Amino acid sequence: SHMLEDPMSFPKGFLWGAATASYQIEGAWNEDGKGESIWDRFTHQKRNILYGHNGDVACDHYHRFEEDVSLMKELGLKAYRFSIAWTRIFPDGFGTVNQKGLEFYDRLINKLVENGIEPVVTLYHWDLPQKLQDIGGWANPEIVNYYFDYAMLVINRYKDKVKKWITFNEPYCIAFLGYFHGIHAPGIKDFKVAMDVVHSLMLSHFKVVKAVKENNIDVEVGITLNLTPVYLQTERLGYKVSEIEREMVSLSSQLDNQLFLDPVLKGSYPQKLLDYLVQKDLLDSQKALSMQQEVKENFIFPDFLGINYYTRAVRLYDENSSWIFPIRWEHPAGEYTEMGWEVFPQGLFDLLIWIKESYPQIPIYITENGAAYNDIVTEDGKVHDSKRIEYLKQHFEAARKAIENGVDLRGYFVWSLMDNFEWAMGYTKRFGIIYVDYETQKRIKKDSFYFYQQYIKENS
Amino acid sequence: SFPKGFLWGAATASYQIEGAWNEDGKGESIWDRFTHQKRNILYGHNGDVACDHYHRFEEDVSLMKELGLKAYRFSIAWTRIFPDGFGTVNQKGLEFYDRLINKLVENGIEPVVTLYHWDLPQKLQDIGGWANPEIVNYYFDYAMLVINRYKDKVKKWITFNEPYCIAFLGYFHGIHAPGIKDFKVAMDVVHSLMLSHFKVVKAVKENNIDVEVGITLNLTPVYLQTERLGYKVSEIEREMVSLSSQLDNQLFLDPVLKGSYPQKLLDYLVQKDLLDSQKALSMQQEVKENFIFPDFLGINYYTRAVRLYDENSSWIFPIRWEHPAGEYTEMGWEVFPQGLFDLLIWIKESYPQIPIYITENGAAYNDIVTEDGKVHDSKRIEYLKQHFEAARKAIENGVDLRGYFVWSLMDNFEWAMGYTKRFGIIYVDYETQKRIKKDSFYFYQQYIKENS
Ligand SMILES: [Cl-]
């Protein structure tokens, strides 16, 4: 008694893309006058990266970008997300502009446009100039202005061709992995410093959004957040959830998600979380107060939200925990990647519905999604990455379902176009749809490349 | 094929299933104590009732017969026999195990008894537990009483289940009873367990008692991440990861089968101030003096470990664990049947010839009872099928494997995880004590029939 409803289509113009970051692919770490970044410094020290790997060569993309753009054209990408290395432009962070750095991004952007691929630029993907770290890095309030001057130089240079700009990639990682856990550059280990960095990143973001809007620059500006939907083990077990468990697991999830979403989309930090941190002597009251006032004063709503989604977390209340919240993580049965991350496409759907229901209307791009498997090249030069294909297929379909349920999703960027340097894990994690043989720098298209090629064709 | 008479079984432990924790004069155990304190067990679960097997054992044996088990591995609760650890023997406790063993025999199921599966009398912990040298004698007297009582019907005896856990989880990590946190004490416990084991083996052999005695070890085969990635392995990584694996495996296998502890491990622990030099010396001397080879080795196998060298590690060895892609259970354990084959081959290659029993293997999945009263545990079936096939392959390659006990006959109290982990081929509804056969029960029923 119900006439067939057609499948929900991806909308016309949907940006099917792939994503990379400068330090992870470019190599050429000291070439053409490029300054030292915090990642150059970090990987050149012992005991920071698995196997002593570094990004000195990486995928050699600074040299091989033309081949890579040819592969993007073959794939049929609508868009390519990449980051600009600040140290190629301003080797010391500020001062004299390095013309050879501008010439590289000129050539890359021109090549993308020549090939009909929309460039999407991340301004900051973790590679702060070491000379700025020498004066405190993101903890130094003057950083906001140095970042702003860099960002506006490149926006003004490339705005004719680059219409979508991402201020920051994954500020959770920049702040907490870089300045609390110290497992990312610059390797600092101080929670209060990390919260200072959170705030610098938010003010930096707003300053760029404000300049773009006030000067009526015809580009869109957003920010990319890694979001982790949180589920209760107690509910998986079918038990009754206590008030204290709900509250503590909620607060723990606010550190991951709302700490960044709320300032960006609502103009305040999540007050219950700041209160908790003050009450636990993890954040000074005076700082909690000033950071809340400064976000209120400087808030401006952005043009889009970028989401990086890989997995979920399952948590429960545990007074014995050593974490900054009394929680532990549990291990639902299922399929896991080489990162030890659960394959959970339902989490992408749930997260997108939650954004739609909990925040003001805004265009959403999935700026990263992908999986690491231990790829083997066959004798006949193939990579039969069937599990990566299954992962992508299921997440693409979760995105379609989100669109069917009214989420304003406007693009989807697979992490990554090519295997690359995975930060403190070195080259040991391969996320590409293209395999890179690091001995030869040969690009080998994986089965997932051909899968995605056909998926784009069928969904555009 | 599986050899004629291969012991297809299932396994339980007393604290995990029995309940009746304070009935019929039973003494308090360290697990009664541990679960009665706050913040030791998920959700504040305890073993006070568990699966109520003390009361419902007749139903359970009927299910074992329906299943077609050749053997049933269970543990005896020391506190039901000697409530105070030594002294007065409790006749009601003996009566229970009499009834259980008689019922197993009546049904044609071979009883296989674990003498100690973690439930030390609290009165013995009160005088230092496994750290008190006199524990060897208290254990010995308990063990010989029950061996002599049941040797007409029970022909396979396991001195200890998982000494790694008894010592390190109970006395170093303190996440198992009795909740102590002292590495040097844990090493004293290791040694007490080894001497206890040898004293029972010696008495059985010296008195010519016609039963077989062994011990059950949880073994974790280790794999290098470096080799998974195809990189060259450094000598230092090989050395450090090897040491880390000796704590899991050789620390227990070497005394039991070769009459020494792994010297390289003891030397490392002494260097790191985790073992006193004089203790390392006396340990080796005493194991040499008391060593006697057992009748069989029990292995508990669930998963492997993938490790790599990392000087930044907080562990007692400079290693970290990696997470290979694949299927994982509710314990966070990789499904890795190749590990069972590799482990068995390694035992054959590395140790003197000895009969092996897999005394535990199984998996935890978040089972749902459907509205039609079934449990469609397809992943548990796939887990078991693959591990059975690994065991078959081991036999085909010359390993003297003589039986295989699925952990567990029924869902039960999983120690510090409480009832949140279900390992059974039979589901237990803890509200009603209903036993519900899972799909894995019928899979196994059919597998036994086809492989016997
Ligand atoms: Cl303009």
Residue numbers in the entry:
A (entry chain A): -6 to 453
B (entry chain B): 2 to 453
How does the study describe this entry?
Bgl1 catalyses the final step of in the decomposition of cellulose, an unbranched glucose polymer that has attracted the attention of researchers in recent years as it is the most abundant renewable source of reduced carbon in the biosphere. Bgl1 is a member of glycosyl hydrolase family 1 (GH1 superfamily, EC 3.2.1.21) and the results showed that the 3D structure of Bgl1 follows the overall architecture of the GH1 family, with a classical (β/α)8 TIM-barrel fold. Bgl1 has a half-life of 250 h at 60°C and it has been shown to be a thermostable enzyme with a broad substrate specificity and saccharification ability that efficiently hydrolyses cellooligosaccharides to glucose. The catalytic site residues of the enzyme are two glutamic acid residues, Glu163 and Glu361, as in other enzymes that belong to the same family.
Here, we report the three-dimensional structures of Bgl1 from the thermophilic bacterium C. saccharolyticus and its complex with glucose, which is the product of its catalytic action when lactose is used as a substrate, that were determined at 1.47 and 1.95 Å resolution, respectively. Comparison of the two monomers in each individual structure showed that they have negligible differences, with an r.m.s.d. on Cα atoms or secondary-structure elements of 0.16 Å for Bgl1. In the case of Bgl1, sufficient electron density to accommodate a glycerol (GOL) molecule and an ethylene glycol (EDO) molecule was observed at the active site of the enzyme and both were added to the model, which was then subjected to refinement. An additional glycerol molecule is bound at the interface of the first monomer (chain A) with a symmetry-related molecule of the second monomer (chain B; symmetry operator −x, y + 1/2, −z).
